[PDB]
């Protein structure tokens, strides 16, 4: 007996070779494997295969290889590739990715995926499932940021702050052992992943360190504080004794030096270079040239992503209300046309194509927004495809390669440079099971649930008093992960390996995951996921073009993105 | 009578800042390619290695602007600034790392800010 | 519908800004939440529109004049910020001193 | 150089002898001092003074005289003076009141205000910064009415209740020890200081007494639990063996006796007078009587302030409503008539502003309106001024002494008579750090952020999801001092002595700051600050005029308020 | 805007208000909530136009009949009462047997 | 009124609804979201006026057609279901392919 392909996808999801265009884009993603036996397809259901017996196991405790959670049918987005598979969750973690069931009866299955009587399902078929988004260009200011995050498929936050003071709403900073201390209590009541940086700044170890002792999971350079060629150099020394890692947004007013001169401070050491292309700040106006060095791990902040015909109108205002700019001062009009350059925002768009900037990050409520990073993330490899066409590593007509670099940048990607990629930002086995299911139609937009260490702490559901969950209003809710002390057990807090070993978790009561940031100081550009690429960036200083292998890096605004206004109300 | 809410009646006068410091008047010049903003509280002998100027009489002082503005060098942009006492214990640590003590030590400022490359030393 | 936090709150601008419109209707002076109500909504609904962040610079500024306002309003609205959906995505609107 | 003062002003805040008006009243206060050394003003961000090596201090760790938070450039309006100074914050206290930054570089630092790497900064520049408010007269009926509270600045709740009991509708009272122990835990939930008041009715000892051992705060006398001379007369023994304050609401019917009964009961020891004008209750018509004596501390409730052209109308039909009266019954009529006067409620203004009253409060749900005890203290103020002129005592065509006079009336007189004082209750060196920020144009009316315990608890902030944090819609908003275990360390609960000796926070599993109640029995009207006046009040038994020193007090009700429909949606 | 918990709030019934004066424009007798919801809007209306407490207890008596609403609507409301901020400040009305 | 909160949600709804249907009114092409909500609000409103659960079933198939919305919409609503509140009680409405 046969079924033909269009019914099959209907049924469980498509299957090799099939195609699947993301939201409204021009992108689309093609199975490239599938894990199932056909005909042995679990699904649950009346009637369905996941009953007692039968697709489901009656024999087998908890402990002899069944799994707390099925994800049935999962259409998988992430570096390691694209390909349908079931995922299996125990205690928390992804245990199995392949083919769930019974053995009893079914050819196929991977032997610690048995659906047994301690199994929840949830079904995933003709649904994407990615990793969940690790932003690590946070400001804790508005508690109301993580929702916002949740619904776009973020799961982790790093950064810093205590709310809407000043330092916090400029710089992404929990100041001290006693503001960290704060901060991780605070942690308790957020449903999200968290890590803590601290102030990078001082010109003695000591007062920098007793932050990492205190719990921070890395630090923070910012030019607001000071950003120095003493404070680079204390930061990072610190951070190779204590192996977490420095971020940087760097002096863009050349004070105390040019980016050679931070680069000189840097040393070769290992460091996140922050909104890389500098619209969000830094070395005027050639900060993106840090892009290219073989020890920087670069990010781009949200809100020059991609570029727009409104993009410049709007970052040279936002810069003048956020600066607290006078049109009638000529040098804060020169200072703003310094920052904000058509010229390095263009070549922007095609190093994140190229795999030069290797991350995404929002810059939340500082110059960024919280919900938007998967989102323009995909609107930039759309806008990419229209102007650079399919790339030359493209195979069936898809855009796997894109699709797989692009997914890298706030998944993978960022977790590495943190040091906490042995705990989350990709589906793979042996790591924690932050989940993001999407319906084709919303990917990258509307996250339909999110999953947390195994449990949905958030979905897209509707009326909580009808007969069924799907009659209207359908919205982002918090779900049972995030209520009473689940949310102790759903979500990590990231912290320094000293802070752990110093007793700092049972000091301040925390009962949340302890997670330990580690590997930070060993690694490179080379280590970012399908955006490995280094090279000569060159920035002109009178004109602001970028240069790369000779040619100058340029396209054009586009004056309509798709994931916009035929998804969002306002 | 109209009521502005919140405003101000400022008293009468100006405020002197910097008072009873010594002031000096220096001529600097950017002789790099890209634009330098020095704000107001920086030691001046530890800004930027190509702004030009002598740098011994950087030492000990910063601009004497506004707390909190900075000077704006454009790139190849000479001109005067006028700078002021530090205060306090006038010390200074970090920063470009030229003086980490007390700004009496000219000669040891001088001699790290002149293998360094910082320009006008002499 | 698929409702996300913001979409949620800014609901609550277009019904602000529904019941200031009724009371200018009816010959009511507003008031600092109304005034900016009305400019917020107005700025949302022109990039709905697909007006540009330029020209809503420009329109923000002629939206109330300083006789639709109570005395001092015009003085307490420094500027008046809102983010919404163009189509090329979100982007901030910036109106500054929009009651002269 | 010089700077002129509209400039200096705008960029530092204002500085000796400015001025600033209220929100849209006619008063201002003006700067009496500045604790600054002109240009070495500190303020944060890029370009500015606050950074490594400059204005922020790299070498020392936090405990060398470095703080956690600084408030920069604050103007303090406090019953200690109006003037402009820096406020130091260090484990969620006020350590240093003066001129913070770097003594490297800087003149005049006050020696424990160092900016170190430990340091979060808060531009206060421009904004007026007081106390949090202390609120005497709460029933606790709804927990939503905590963000009200701290919407209009209120960081402090004292009073009783259990929720909608018609108990607690009727009285600020927890009654008995399992009723104060559930509310106890129930504290560890809301984000605001608490104190707890026993049921202070009973004619032997012990069922009072039980009340402070279980962790009540104090006690209220209350007529609808008969508050006969019996019940007052041990409510005092109590609180006079347990240093605790006992809240008076008194006999209005008369029943056991007239006002001279009540203080025969009380015979010399120190209460509390509630809405000591008696529209909120108390012997008519001659309560407001209670204000004159040196061994009473008097406070009003909001209502009734001002005298308004409305005032009456709402009263009596308030009244009517409240007390299910009914207008065919003619002893229901003359009750409303004997207890809503005209005659003291406009004495009651002025009475505020000769300092004869010496405390607000809101009875909120009761008879009160939570969020507007600060705004009705000013609209008050203003009011006076209109009527009466400047003060006497008044200077440079400033109100300050005024101004002095009324925030103590909702800052650190209701502290002293709780017995909180060495808590809260004012911006000095030592005490609790809880901080009201407001803009000017605001003051009174909406708080921009209110500071508990060092950390921010509540703001007016805009849009979660934008890149910056002003856009619309700006509303008050929870921030992250009260979520997760932070709510425990920037809140106290207050409780008695005993139940502290006792064990009853370690019994009950409290995690919040514990405060001591303590001082209360030792204080009298020479104590509050400002209002500190005692004189023979007469109150006309057929016209119910009320004399001081042989003259009738009357003013007329305005038909138009301040901080009303300028900023009021509703 | 500056909104405080009780302007969100209030804003719900302005809403509501307007549904049930839809409801009754189409020609439906109104139930309670309706009921309710019109007769409170229009009290806080009547205070931002500046009418006195004692107006408003006039007033709120005439703005539905029992006509205008379901069979024992009028028992089922014995006064509505509402709090809005008069030129004045904020003061409470309440309205007795408004529908009668 | 004594809202219970599905009554609090459902406002938002008609909120929702009629931003909806003043963009319609100045010419626009409906969004996702606002044919949602347009649709959902003529159910309940339908509810409210006592038609049956069969009638709104045929009827929310043509409040909408696909000139109304932008491409691609009809294509994302598959269906579209609400509670209410009929005479005879909560039932819910499913209304199948709105737009064709
Ligand atoms: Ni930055
Ligand atoms: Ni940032
Ligand atoms: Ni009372
Ligand atoms: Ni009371």
Not at chain 1, 52 to 65: A, D, I, K, Q
Not at chain 1, 106 to 124: C, F, L, Q, S, Y
Not at chain 1, 370 to 381: D, H, I, P, S
Not at chain 1, 554 to 560: A, D, L, Q, R, S
């Amino acid at each position: 007996m046969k079924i033909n392909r269009q019914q099959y996808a209907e049924s469980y999801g498509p299957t090799v070779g099939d195609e699947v265009r993301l939201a409204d884009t021009d992108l689309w993603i093609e199975v490239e494997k599938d894990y199932t036996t056909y005909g042995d397809e679990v699904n649950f259901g009346g009637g369905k295969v996941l009953r007692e017996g039968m697709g489901e196991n009656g024999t087998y405790t908890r402990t002899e290889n069944v799994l707390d959670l099925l994800l049935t049918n999962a259409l998988i987005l992430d570096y390691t590739g694209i390909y349908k598979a079931d995922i299996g969750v125990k205690d928390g973690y992804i245990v199995g990715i392949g083919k769930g069931g019974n053995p009893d009866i079914m050819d196929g299955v991977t032997p610690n995926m048995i659906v047994g009587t301690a199994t929840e399902v949830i079904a995933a078929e003709g649904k994407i499932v990615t990793a969940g988004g690790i932003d690590t260009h946070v400001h804790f200011i508005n508690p109301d940021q993580v929702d916002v995050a949740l619904a776009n498929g973020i799961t982790t936050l790093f950064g810093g702050g205590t709310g809407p003071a000043e330092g916090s709403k400029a710089t992404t900073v929990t100041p001290g052992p006693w503001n960290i201390e704060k901060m991780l209590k605070s942690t308790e009541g957020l449903p999200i992943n968290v890590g803590i940086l601290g102030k990078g700044h001082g010109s003695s170890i000591a007062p920098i360190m007793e932050q990492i002792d205190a719990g921070a999971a890395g630090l923070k350079i910012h030019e607001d504080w000071g950003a120095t060629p003493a404070s680079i150099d204390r930061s990072l020394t610190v951070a190779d004794e204590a192996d977490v890692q420095v971020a940087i947004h760097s002096d863009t007013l050349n004070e105390a030096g040019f980016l050679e001169d931070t680069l000189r401070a840097i040393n070769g050491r290992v460091i996140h270079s922050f909104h890389v292309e500098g619209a969000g700040g830094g070395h005027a106006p050639d900060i993106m040239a840090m892009a290219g060095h073989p020890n920087v791990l670069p990010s781009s902040t949200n809100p020059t992503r991609p570029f727009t015909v409104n993009t410049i109108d709007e970052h040279l205002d936002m810069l003048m209300v956020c600066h607290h700019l006078k049109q009638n001062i000529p040098e804060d009009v020169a200072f703003a046309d310094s920052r904000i350059r058509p010229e390095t925002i263009a070549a922007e768009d095609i190093l994140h194509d190229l795999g030069i900037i290797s991350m995404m990050s929002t810059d939340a409520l500082a110059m960024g927004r919280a919900g938007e990073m998967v989102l323009r993330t995909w609107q930039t490899a759309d806008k990419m495809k229209k102007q650079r066409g399919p790339l030359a590593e493209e195979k069936n007509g898809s855009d796997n390669f894109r699709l797989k670099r692009y997914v890298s940048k706030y998944t993978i990607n960022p977790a590495i440079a943190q040091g906490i990629a042995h705990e989350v930002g990709s589906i793979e086995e042996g790591k924690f099971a932050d989940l993001v299911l999407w319906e084709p139609k919303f990917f990258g937009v509307k996250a339909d649930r999110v999953i947390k260490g195994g449990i949905i702490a958030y979905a897209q559901i509707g009326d909580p008093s009808a007969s069924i969950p799907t009659p209207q209003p359908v919205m982002g809710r918090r779900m049972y992960g995030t209520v009473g002390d689940l949310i102790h057990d759903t979500n990590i807090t990231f912290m320094s390996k000293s802070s752990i070993q110093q007793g700092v978790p049972a000091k301040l009561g925390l009962k949340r995951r302890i997670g330990t940031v580690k590997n930070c100081r060993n690694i490179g550009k080379k280590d970012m996921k399908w955006n490995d690429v280094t090279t000569d960036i060159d920035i002109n200083p009178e004109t602001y073009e970028v240069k790369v292998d000779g040619e100058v890096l340029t396209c054009e605004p586009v004056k309509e993105l798709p994931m916009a206004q035929r998804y969002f109300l306002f | 009578n109209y009521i502005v809410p919140g405003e101000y009646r400022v008293a009468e006068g100006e405020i002197e800042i910097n008072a009873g410091r010594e002031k000096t008047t220096i001529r600097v010049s950017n002789t790099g390619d890209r634009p330098i903003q020095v704000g107001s509280h920086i030691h001046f002998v530890e800004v930027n290695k190509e702004l030009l100027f002598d740098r011994a009489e950087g030492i000990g002082r910063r601009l004497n602007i506004p707390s909190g503005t900075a000077a704006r060098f454009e790139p190849g942009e000479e001109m005067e600034v006028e700078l002021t006492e530090l205060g306090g214990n006038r010390e200074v640590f970090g920063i470009s790392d030229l003086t980490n003590g007390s700004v009496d030590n000219k000669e040891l400022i001088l001699q790290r800010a002149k293998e360094l490359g910082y320009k006008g030393v002499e | 519908m698929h409702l996300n936090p913001a979409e949620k709150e800014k609901l609550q601008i277009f019904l602000a800004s529904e019941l200031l419109l009724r009371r200018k209707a009816r010959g009511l002076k507003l008031n600092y939440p109304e005034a900016v109500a009305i400019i917020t909504s107005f700025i949302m609904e022109g990039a709905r529109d697909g007006k540009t962040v330029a020209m809503l610079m420009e329109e923000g500024k002629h939206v109330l004049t300083r006789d639709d306002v109570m005395e001092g309003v015009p003085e307490m609205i420094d500027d008046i910020q809102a983010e919404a959906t163009f189509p090329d995505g979100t982007k901030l609107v910036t109106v500054h001193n929009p009651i002269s």
